[PDB]
């Protein structure tokens, strides 16, 4: 059976990631879900949707929650985009040809923020781990990891090829550098978290947890360990919540010196830091009444060097912001807020004061937005689509243009459906308010207000589209008939308990009503004679569908299982469990029995209704899928989630002994080359100075591991075990015994490591010459007997030194014990 693919995502304009801006109100890149969008904000529409070259739910794609975009940073000179995803992989993009050019990952959880090095050809990324990683842009390689924070970094700032400041989810400012390569300075910034830091060279402002920002002196001049970066003082905010981003804006000889702070609730405060001229003239003004109390009141500071003047204030909860300014007159500030809405502000100012109490929203991009959870969905006869949310703003879409055609506010809208020619939508709210709208003309046709005294929770048409059933929260299901332009209520039907989901048969046979009693009544529409009461869920059924020939309902609840029920007697075929949060909407393909279960786990599956396998499993959402609907004659399904995305799916090894042997002979070859080099340097310097040998080059293995040869053979002699050692250095021949003796010379001409491996060296050497004694004393080499003279003398000196220390300590400590007993036994 053929499969389903993704077209794209539509209706997501501002996700959970920071925005950055491109100059020429300029271009603007934010993240949509798992792909990024490129805009102009004057025209107020998309110019390019950068997506990755892999369709989700495809025959190439994999089964997992797809990686959410969560940070943006643009470097506009070479035109690169660093994108970073919520699994922890960072890609970069040429923004022109739209192709990924580096795709590296080293992070485990989601990243937190990127930063380019200002065309340093290196990108530094900080995670929600304890990771700050430096990566090359021309390597596909990480320069280095950077790791001493406890929990999760929040902000950082680098400078040059040398220094960096960082701050984390525990309040610890850390200072790092390239060369010494570790942390150098640490402070507790706040008692809890610490979310944003910002610098222009001298000072460091940080935010805290609740309205305690803090001023710090940088000092990269000072060569004093404690105090590379000190603090001075604090001040407060208007908002009593965690400021989570600060940044500076500056200019030349106007002294732009403004920094902003994103509060965590609907608010962005802005501040000015002020020049030395007004600092100098105001210091004496505070130094009126004229020394100890003067310096105390001066330390009590940031009140003087700060200047809070404007607290811009949006419609609802903000999410991310970015700056632009020009020459002492205007400051313009992009803000993409929580739901898919961006809000580009501007303020005039007289470079001491704004001279306007409120900021100016010069632009607001609003078109493809939805502003709440889109909780209902429809699709007409393959000619237009629908989206419906608690905003009020129903949004009517088209297939191959994806533009918000019509938009008009109703209320807390949760269920809606077309009229059978299209062209008109009926809808219900959180009260008994039923709204009818058209496609093109004057929007609010009518509203039956107080159709019920409680909420309504589902509704459906008939097949011909004249009678209209709804099921409502007041234990009531009610009928309507359209009249030519309005509605007429005709038939109330009280129930024993509370309906929450209805559905009519597609060949208008009968209607199924759920209850919050864990059951569904199948109920005639001609006669209402209570055909069936089929049950067995134990938590209320909250989606109902009927087969295309009224033979087989598919019912589903918050018990995560869906039940496929034959209608000839209300019997079952399967009760099958999927989707481990809950189901909330199952939809039926209009020709065969293949149905689509959405979940509250960002997953839709379509299943055949006779063999019950999830013949396709589909993952491309991020949050709870709040509606879906399949097309009439397309096999063409729309689905809308809590992340404000709607989207449409369409048809298609040595051992011990010899290791010691070979490491020993390469080390001895290196050592003998070095001593021949010392003889050749004797020939160059301390001889008839005509020429020389140049250099025996370093051996590749010990140069790569950066080890002296005696330390390398000491490493392998260390790593062989105690048990097989006695035959490991019994395998080796007498020539290898001889170069082992040469190693013992060159290792006891180095008292650094001789004293730290002395019993090992002694046990090995004494067993070697005890086993090889018969050939050793028959060897005839005067340099060898001088060699073991040297070994005997220096080894016995080291042993008698350490046993001198041990005997001295024995006698001293037992003297101490015996004289304490002599004192008070």
């Amino acid at each position: 059976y053929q499969r389903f693919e993704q077209a794209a995502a539509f209706g997501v304009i501002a996700s959970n990631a920071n925005c950055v801006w491109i100059p020429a109100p300029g271009q603007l890149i934010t993240s949509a879900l798992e792909d990024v969008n490129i805009w102009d904000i004057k025209t107020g529409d998309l110019v390019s949707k950068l997506s990755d070259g892999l369709p989700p739910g495809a025959s190439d794609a994999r089964g997992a929650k797809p990686a959410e975009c969560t940070y943006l940073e643009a470097h506009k000179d070479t035109d690169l985009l660093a994108v970073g995803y919520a699994d922890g992989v960072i890609k970069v993009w040429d923004l022109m040809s739209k192709t990924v050019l580096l795709n590296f990952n080293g992070h485990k959880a989601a990243i937190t923020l990127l930063q380019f090095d200002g065309t340093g050809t290196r990108l530094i990324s900080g995670s929600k781990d304890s990771n700050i990683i430096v990566w090359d842009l021309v390597g596909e390689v990480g320069l280095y990891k950077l790791r001493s924070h406890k929990d999760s970094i929040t902000g950082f700032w680098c400078q040059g090829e040398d220094w960096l400041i960082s701050t984390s989810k525990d309040g610890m400012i850390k200072l790092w550098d390239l060369k010494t390569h570790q942390c150098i300075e640490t402070h507790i910034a706040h008692t809890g978290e610490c979310w944003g830091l910002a610098v222009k060279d001298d000072l460091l402002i940080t935010t805290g947890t609740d309205s305690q920002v803090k001023i710090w002196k940088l000092d990269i001049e000072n060569d004093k360990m404690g105090g590379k970066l000190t603090e001075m003082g604090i001040f407060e905010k208007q908002s009593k919540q965690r400021g989570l981003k600060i940044e500076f804006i500056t200019n030349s000889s106007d002294k732009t010196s403004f920094f902003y702070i994103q509060n965590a609730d609907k608010t962005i405060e802005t501040f000015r830091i002020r020049k030395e001229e007004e600092i100098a003239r105001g210091l004496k003004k505070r130094e009126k009444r004229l020394l100890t109390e003067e310096e105390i009141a001066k330390s009590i500071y940031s009140s003087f060097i700060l200047h809070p003047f404007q607290t811009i204030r949006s419609l609802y909860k903000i999410k991310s912001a970015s700056w632009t300014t020009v020459s002492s007159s205007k400051l313009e500030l992009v803000l993409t807020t929580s739901s898919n809405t961006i809000e580009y502000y501007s303020i005039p100012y007289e470079k001491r004061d704004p001279t306007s109490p409120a900021p100016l929203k010069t632009h607001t991009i609003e078109l493809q937005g939805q502003r709440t959870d889109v909780r209902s969905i429809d699709i007409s006869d393959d000619n237009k689509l629908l989206a419906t949310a608690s905003n009020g703003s129903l949004k009517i879409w088209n297939i191959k243009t994806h533009k918000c055609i019509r938009t008009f506010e109703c209320g807390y809208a949760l269920t809606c459906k077309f009229l059978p020619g299209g062209l008109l939508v009926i809808l219900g709210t959180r009260n008994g308010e039923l709204q009818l709208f058209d496609l093109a003309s004057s929007s609010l046709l009518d509203t039956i207000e107080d159709a019920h005294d409680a909420a309504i929770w589902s509704l459906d048409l008939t097949s011909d589209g004249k009678r209209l059933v709804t099921g409502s929260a007041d234990k009531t299901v009610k009928f309507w008939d359209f009249k030519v332009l309005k509605l007429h209520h005709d038939t109330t039907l009280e129930l024993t308990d509370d309906i929450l989901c209805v559905r009519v048969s597609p060949d208008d046979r009968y209607l199924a009503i759920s209850l919050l009693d864990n059951t569904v009544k199948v109920f005639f529409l001609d006669s209402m004679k209570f055909y069936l009461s089929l049950y067995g869920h134990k938590l209320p059924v909250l989606s109902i569908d009927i087969s295309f020939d009224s033979k087989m309902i598919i019912t589903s609840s918050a018990d995560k299982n869906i039940k496929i029920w034959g209608l000839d007697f209300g019997d079952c075929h399967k009760s099958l469990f999927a989707h481990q949060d809950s189901i909330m909407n199952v939809k039926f393909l209009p020709q065969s029995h293949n149905f689509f279960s959405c979940s509250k786990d960002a997953v839709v599956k379509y299943w055949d209704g006779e063999k019950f396998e999830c013949i396709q499993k589909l993952y491309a959402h991020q949050s709870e899928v709040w509606a879906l609907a399949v097309a009439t004659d397309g096999g063409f399904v729309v689905s809308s989630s809590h992340d404000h995305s709607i989207r449409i799916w369409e048809e298609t090894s040595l051992k011990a002994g010899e290791r010691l042997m070979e490491a020993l002979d390469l080390g001895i070859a290196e050592i003998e080359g070095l001593e021949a080099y010392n003889r050749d340097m004797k020939l160059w310097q301390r001889k008839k100075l005509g020429e020389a040998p140049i250099k025996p080059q370093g051996n590749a293995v010990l140069i790569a591991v950066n080890k002296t040869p005696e330390q390398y053979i000491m490493d392998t002699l260390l790593r062989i075990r105690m048990s097989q050692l006695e035959d490991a250095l019994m395998v080796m021949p007498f020539s290898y015994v001889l170069k082992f003796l040469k190693f013992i010379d060159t290792v006891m001409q180095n008292k650094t490591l001789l004293h730290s491996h002395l019993p090992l060296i002694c046990k090995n050497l004494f067993f070697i010459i005890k086993f090889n004694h018969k050939e050793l004393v028959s060897q005839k080499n005067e340099e060898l007997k001088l060699q073991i003279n040297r070994v005997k003398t220096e080894l016995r000196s080291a042993l008698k030194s350490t046993e001198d220390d041990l005997g001295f300590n024995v006698q001293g400590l037992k003297f101490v014990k015996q004289q304490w007993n002599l004192r008070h036994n």
Binding site: H755, P759, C762, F766, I769, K770, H773, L776, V777, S778, Q779, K780, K785, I788, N789, V791, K792, L795, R796, L799, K800, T802, E803, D805, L806, G807, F808, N809, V810, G812, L813, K814, F815, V816, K817, Q819, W820, R823
Partner: protein, 81 residues
């Protein structure tokens, strides 16, 4: 007394051992032995340090004892010619 706690617990091995013996040598070479005795609780430390370093003395003494096979190989190689 914290240093001698950690030094006694270093004294059990043979690898982390000589540096324990040398810091014992340091603190008893420098401090007053009367002060070392009248520090309270330290006799429980020092009587557990004593037999370990007695054992290590015997072990290194056997090492330097069997070191003389180099001298025997030397005197035989001198007997050679």
């Amino acid at each position: 007394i914290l240093l001698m706690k950690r030094c006694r617990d270093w004294n059990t091995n043979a690898k982390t051992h000589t540096i324990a013996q040398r810091t014992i040598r340091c603190i008893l070479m420098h401090h007053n032995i009367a002060k070392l005795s009248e520090i309270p609780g330290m006799v429980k430390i020092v009587d557990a340090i004593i037999p370990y370093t007695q054992r290590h003395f015997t072990r290194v003494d056997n090492l330097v004892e069997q070191s003389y096979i180099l001298d025997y190989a030397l005197v035989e190689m001198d007997k050679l010619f």
